Design a binder for this molecule. Sequence first.
Ligand SMILES: NC(=O)c1ccc[n+]([C@@H]2O[C@H](COP(=O)([O-])OP(=O)(O)OC[C@H]3O[C@@H](n4cnc5c(N)ncnc54)[C@H](OP(=O)(O)O)[C@@H]3O)[C@@H](O)[C@H]2O)c1
Lengths: 498, 498, 498, 498
Amino acid sequence: VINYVEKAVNKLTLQMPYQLFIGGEFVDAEGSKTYNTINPTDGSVICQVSLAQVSDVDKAVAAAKEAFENGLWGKINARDRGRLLYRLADVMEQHQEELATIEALDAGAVYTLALKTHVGMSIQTFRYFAGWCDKIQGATIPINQARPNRNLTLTKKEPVGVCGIVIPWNYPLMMLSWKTAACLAAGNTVVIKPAQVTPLTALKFAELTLKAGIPKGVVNILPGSGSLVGQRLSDHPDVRKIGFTGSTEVGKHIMKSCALSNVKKVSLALGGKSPLIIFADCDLNKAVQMGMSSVFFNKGENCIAAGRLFVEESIHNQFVQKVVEEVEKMKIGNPLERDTNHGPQNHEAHLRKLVEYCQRGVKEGATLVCGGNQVPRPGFFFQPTVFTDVEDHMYIAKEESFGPIMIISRFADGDVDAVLSRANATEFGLASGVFTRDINKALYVSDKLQAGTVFINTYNKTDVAAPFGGFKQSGFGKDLGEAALNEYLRIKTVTFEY
Amino acid sequence: VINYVEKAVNKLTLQMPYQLFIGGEFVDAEGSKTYNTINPTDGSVICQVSLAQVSDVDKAVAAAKEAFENGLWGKINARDRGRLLYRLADVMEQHQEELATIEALDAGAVYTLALKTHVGMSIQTFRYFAGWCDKIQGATIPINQARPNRNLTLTKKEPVGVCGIVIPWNYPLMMLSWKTAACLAAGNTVVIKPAQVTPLTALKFAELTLKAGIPKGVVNILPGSGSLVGQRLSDHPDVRKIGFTGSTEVGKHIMKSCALSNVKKVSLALGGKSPLIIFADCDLNKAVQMGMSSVFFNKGENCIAAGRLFVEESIHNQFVQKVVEEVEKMKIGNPLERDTNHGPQNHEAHLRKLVEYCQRGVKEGATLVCGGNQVPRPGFFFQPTVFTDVEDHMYIAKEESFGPIMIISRFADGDVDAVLSRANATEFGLASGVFTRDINKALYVSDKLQAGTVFINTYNKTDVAAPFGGFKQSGFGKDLGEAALNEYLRIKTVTFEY
Amino acid sequence: VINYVEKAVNKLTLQMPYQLFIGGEFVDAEGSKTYNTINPTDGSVICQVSLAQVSDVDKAVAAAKEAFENGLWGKINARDRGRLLYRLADVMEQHQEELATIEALDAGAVYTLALKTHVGMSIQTFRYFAGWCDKIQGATIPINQARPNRNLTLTKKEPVGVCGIVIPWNYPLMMLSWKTAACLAAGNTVVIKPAQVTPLTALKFAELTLKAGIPKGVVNILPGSGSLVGQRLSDHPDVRKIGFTGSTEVGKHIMKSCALSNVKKVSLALGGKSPLIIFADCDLNKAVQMGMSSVFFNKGENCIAAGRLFVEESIHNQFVQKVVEEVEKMKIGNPLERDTNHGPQNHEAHLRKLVEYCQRGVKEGATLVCGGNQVPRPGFFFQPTVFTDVEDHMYIAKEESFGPIMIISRFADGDVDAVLSRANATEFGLASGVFTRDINKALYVSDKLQAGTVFINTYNKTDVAAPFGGFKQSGFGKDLGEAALNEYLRIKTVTFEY
Amino acid sequence: VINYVEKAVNKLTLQMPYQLFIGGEFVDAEGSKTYNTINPTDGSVICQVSLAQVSDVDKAVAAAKEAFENGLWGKINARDRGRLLYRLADVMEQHQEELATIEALDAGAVYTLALKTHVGMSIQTFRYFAGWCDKIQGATIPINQARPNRNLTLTKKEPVGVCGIVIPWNYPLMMLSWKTAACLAAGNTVVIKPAQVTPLTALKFAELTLKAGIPKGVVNILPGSGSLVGQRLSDHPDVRKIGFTGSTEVGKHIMKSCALSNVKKVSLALGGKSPLIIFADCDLNKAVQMGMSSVFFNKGENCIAAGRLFVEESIHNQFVQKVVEEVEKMKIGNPLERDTNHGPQNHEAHLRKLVEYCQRGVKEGATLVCGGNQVPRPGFFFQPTVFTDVEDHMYIAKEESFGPIMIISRFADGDVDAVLSRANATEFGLASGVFTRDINKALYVSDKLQAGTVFINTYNKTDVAAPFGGFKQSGFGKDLGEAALNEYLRIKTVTFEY
Ligand SMILES: NC(=O)c1ccc[n+]([C@@H]2O[C@H](COP(=O)([O-])OP(=O)(O)OC[C@H]3O[C@@H](n4cnc5c(N)ncnc54)[C@H](OP(=O)(O)O)[C@@H]3O)[C@@H](O)[C@H]2O)c1
């Protein structure tokens, strides 16, 4: 029997595994080491969670290797691999309320949003990639013939093997799902390291793989520290690919580690400072609604969040007035209250960074219009914040807050190339957006923006079929869409003479 | 007017540029520094070549950046970019004898081979990729609609920008062409670092880009050292991708440097220890001819060379006997002489390694059947070598010679999985081959071999349309074929709401 | 509430609808006209089925048009269309025993085969194409730019609209599923005409679309005659595409009718006379098993059945002896009995044709080795038959039997091109096969065979992912695979200047 | 030595073949039959041209069949087929002034336009498709495995064989080139029937195939009548595919003939009545320029010409005034004169139809604003024409003029869905257009338009890389782009068990 932490909450009795998941079983870490996971709504300890050690990483990688090389997963038809992944999505759907509640408790995700996005999109991801399994195809190629003989050349798409995936804490289940679905659909096996601060939905997910009948060792989950677990995964001689999502600085380190061990493949989904350009010829009330969402969605803990808004001079003051009006209407509180719009920040150290970020913004001369502070109440709540009079040289015009902080600059009426230059003057390149009713401006701006995703007259519109990844120091490689599969496949060329 | 080293040779008058090529002009390096390039047929100095410095790398990158951002290359139609690359191929064709002669002098490539392969395949590479320019396409994707509104999602394929490419010395022009053609077809601009020991066809190529009308700064060429030029390219904040071909150990360093600077993209085409499995049921005389070619082609300086031959017990002794007869018929000599079929090794340091390699082979207990030594004559000639009684634990069963050394092991009659296990017991995974008349065996073996390319009843059958790249510590990414374009493109997702 | 014909059989209760299915309801035909459907196991009447009239065709097309233009099917996300088709496959699976039993009663399909193939592959088909819905993608194309302006060109894949599909009787549910799954996945609506002699699984399928929640009018089913119902579908001005499977002569008429009405798109999956070439170097015992399967599978009522076997002279006599021995072992009888492996022919007129076919074979001088007659028991059973000494000019060498009749010719030892000529001497080109252990022969023969499918060392190996269709007078267009979708999609090119 | 009609015009000496082109030679038709080709600028006879008979069609098809089955074209590498097609494009470019002059004499094409489009796009078409030859690729497919055995399934793309193509007279060389280039790139051989009235560029093209070294019999050209030559091509037992461009009514007959003979594949590029919707929020002066182009380009002999303009009420009168001002500036004259804007109609019978068309427009009650008449000068010139107050029930609202007649209707301010319904109320669906600055309207309207091509803020923007084809009674199949290749290829599925 699996040991659970039991909790009666949100009309449910949650049953939460808290141990490492290796080779299809929940097990204590070496020396039974544990750590505390903290509820951000009140700062209380949810439970103790196993703290993976090096020997545990080695056990997990060994179980993944055996599952890949000798287990059922490497033998079944691609179509049957698809069936299992569809079934996993069904099991996740059957537990969707429980998963969303766990995400509310562990990450501070507003429950209504967690149902639809954190969990709903996770389900869509497994279903989408389940469909790809038997539709991954190689080629036959019309090469030059070695006359008087003949040649046939074909390519085969094959799995890469044992993969390690390292996940951040902002959407714990969803970020896990994005990478894991594509990885498994391609026929690989995996060791997953969730962010230390948010292990619980990953562990519940591990249990669901058992209910779905995923063969033992195909999925292994190791809560613990990046500097220990993530490091060993990146160094391991039997891991052939790392999928990493997190900060640019840690990304650099991970890629270095892959290089120095066995030149394992790596994908890097790193930070952003994404610009949103709002022209005077946009629908203004819609621009305010979408502009607010671009910043405040999931309490700003959103890698594609608009980190600068450029607003055309003639509409700037009305835009800011409408924003302040809307911001005052936002309900801050417990993620389980059904009218909550704004939940708490994910953990204490992040809240403190946001406090300092805003002090720095004021110190360097930006205008704090509203917010800027921790909300006085238990837990780790931060006020929705608006800065104006932001200039291009400022720290807050360059650095990603990863919090609910709207950072506004004017641009001159009738200018286009000049605002584009400013929007592109970052080493990041993850996302961007443009609001305008003018088809010509919309198309030109989307061409010129140096970012992996461009939203036109919307924001935060990701989709499991639409590839997602950054340019420049936001990294490389895609999650989602057909393109995600390529990170997890290798191509073998086979050439016959006959 | 360009400064040339003039040489009357092979019934031609060679005109060889010898300077750095930056922003469409031939220039001396900082401080007029130079180094000598050596003719491997007699060990003499061909000429002095400019020795690129750090300031020269920065100039080249700046010229590439300007050509990309502001020059004609970034403005013209993809179709017209194609026309220029085709014209480049035509200019190379018009200079084919001259290019093949330069490759004979600089790399010791046998002239008849250089004409057909080194140069002939380079021409095919530019023509093939010229065809791809206006056929690189993105997608429109059926995402979920934000009802009552509608959504359109498309992807755009865009160039990555300024690329650095670092090339080895075994097929100087061909290896340059593989990477450069795909890079340029994708709309990028490039800084190329040829191997220090083989700069001359690259510099002549640079002049041919002028004749073809390639805009200034699109192609820049920096002869010099890897530890200086290559390092600065991998470190440079304006370079966005490195394409690297060379040793696994240098590959590890390159990738690390990419990580620590600006997480530039990297492709790695590294070493191999490729197995060739010869079954008793093959066509024996053909297996001898193709087995010969798998080792001795281009004096063994061939990344896909068979590094181990596994021969079935019942035909082993007859195979070895027939190989020896054919080895004895090989004419060793000056690459410009028409009856030469074995030219000299590329440079002195490589010759020294081959000598040491065979010393270690004999020391550890392998049977040296013939060769193993430098040929007594001027230059850097190495006697075609055959080892038998090679056991799996031996150094020469594990390490890549990159020379004309056939390394033969036996396997028991009727065994298949046992010989596959041995063939796959390497950290490399570049190429492999199987000779057999049995359809079932050929298909099963090609499935089970852990290599990026599998040859069936042939060897060394590369084609510009067929992708080429390794698994495991042989690296990642493809040269050739449609797949090669992906390394040099980025995908932007554009999502509208309307 | 739906009216059923109820029957207790095969350890279940069959509930069979027997009326037309139009706009989501079961309804009598005009004038309450009906016809009898006949059980081929005993010659008895299963039940009366509604006989669709021209006015019923018009009602069905109108319901399909309305469902497409104004109903939910034309409004929902592609992903949600996928969900509904996956639910339909689930519902089919829940009713798999019932469906397979109906197929045994209506078509004479051996129940164990029907469960695995007739029904099992139908379920796979819906699941395969359900996965395609949100993976059907258009392109973005790098066209020449009208400088100083810019251009964006994309393609959109759109449904064709109302489709008519006309099905033969050999695999009633399976043939329906092949076409219907691809058609619906592409977002079309459909009017289906099952063969008059086999309406029952189509009508049960109709009921299952209600259980799955497929919107009204998306699927319409019209049992009746081709000369009436099929004709009107091909003539109808609101039908935009016809998918036809059947004889070559009816296909000609269908295509003509499409031309003369509104140039509706058409696919034709027509007859075949498929050659199987068996070389002396094959595995003989396996060649007998697979050779028998190529002819006798599904009592020979199989469009891809091998219609001629060419057997190398040196193994001919031993092959024929072994076939005769295995034929004697076949259990002919009631398709619901578990030991049965040869069921009755589909209907009486077909049995009569087979009797006449074999009489003609004997008259023209072929050696009847075994079979040739009706089996002396109730229903329409025909003996598994073997002819030898078949010459190229013979009627039975040219005409498709569509029954369990093995038609054997010799070819000289060592001939390859000579037998290929004879194998290709037909205006048909549906399938073909070759048995040999020789890799060079297999690859060469598969190149040279003029047929849409070539099996190598197997036969009857169809798969929902592998496209299926003929060449020459076997028609054009594919069922199955990604390729099938193109028959049911139209491409809209959209070009912007900005 | 080829017989020519020599003519000194346009500062060149034209050398025009005038005979049938069969199996690499120019030959007289049976009984030395001829007909006159007429210059539309003055009505004079240019020369006598061979008049192909049935026996001549049989000779051409035989030559094409021999070239495909036994000639060099079926033996060479795909890459070398590409080389020949690129050489063909080069030869066409070397003769571009001569070809453009012939097109001016034969078709009345304004010379400056013929250089850029009639000939310029023809050259681009051959270069584009030349690049496809070695990039046409099949697939490897992950089918279910027949355990304990394994399966490999691949597809091969193969040529269809002998094709017949039937061309109209509006862009004689360009229409020939569209179809011929894709057909030959796919590896087929061809018999071409140019429109009887415009045979000369086709015959000159034939001679250029000799200069380019295209093997004899690969291209055969038969000037003559459709009811004889075209009919026999559609009926021929050795022809496997017909590519037809022309009227809907002849298309119907063509498809019927394909049906009744050997179910040869057919593509149909038929008529159009393409709508152009102009919103009040467009750029008006640009809308006038592009609106005029949409009608008057190539004297209106343009299958995608806007056959109706719907103009928003508030801008209608100003739009009409501006069009009138600009029409008065058009220079009507000899197509060889550099100042000519508007050349003569293609032939006399077509001119007479246009006169009758405009009489009927006035009779039925539309307002004739300008033009409507034959210009008073020699040859077959027609005045650029503008109708307003066109109602939906009028003949000129339904029928394709195929001449320079702008047919304008109003729609109410704000009335998007209503104008769409009117624009879609046709059985044609070839092209369409929308002018608006509003991104929402542009995207919504392009979704809703029932046409194969939608232009947004432009018109007549075709490109060799963008597929072109209609919906509904405008036919099916694409010319141009990757999609065109599928009409000229067949897919063979090869499935191994091992
Ligand atoms: N290539 C493939 O995928 C494939 C698969 C299965 C079978 N087949 C071929 O099908 C043939 C066996 O079936 P069959 O001989 O019974 O075929 P068939 O006579 O051509 O009938 C096929 C269907 O067409 C209908 N039909 C007849 N006349 C029509 C008309 N004028 N307009 C529209 N529809 C009309 C028939 O209706 P009724 O019910 O009234 O007869 C039946 O539903 C064999 O040659 C076999 O190879 C091919």
